[PDB]
């Protein structure tokens, strides 16, 4: 694949490792200019209540923001999702 | 304000009057050349599910896209909110 698909492969890699995370359902990843905007939507379970999906949320965001160089911007949010 | 504050309180306005919004707690609006990308976080009641509360986001993304032009790129995410 081309340099934007790694990146978004190491992404996903990063994010589907935190517990919780059912998946990486969406990644948008872009540059403006030299570093990446990122939107994320993961899959959790359907019995999250919005506070425990958000607190994934931002376990997601920490260990991609820990890992991955170059973002500007990561933006992550949950839907329930009933398959992994 | 600049011309982005007006733009980010057209957005916010659209937001807020969608059944289920407790408020728009943060929205990070950029013009990328002339399109807009913006990230919006709502706040929505502790005791939402998460499909719930994703429902309100899907609501919200609709209202906005709906009536504020120019946006190439809306992400909404919920958090629970105990005040308004």
Same mark, same amino acid.
């Given at each position: 694949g081309s340099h934007m698909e790694a990146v978004q492969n190491r992404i996903v890699?990063?994010?589907?490792?935190?517990?919780?995370?059912?998946?990486?359902? %969406?990644?948008?990843?872009r540059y403006v200019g030299q570093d990446i905007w990122a939107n994320m939507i993961i899959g959790v379970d359907p019995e999250n209540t919005v506070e425990?999906? %958000?607190?994934?949320?931002?376990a997601v965001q920490a260990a991609v923001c820990g890992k991955i160089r170059r973002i500007e911007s990561l933006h992550v949010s949950a839907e329930a999702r009933e398959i992994g």
């Open positions: 890699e990063a994010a589907e490792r935190v517990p919780g995370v059912r998946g990486v359902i %969406h990644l948008r990843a425990q999906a %958000h607190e994934i949320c931002e």
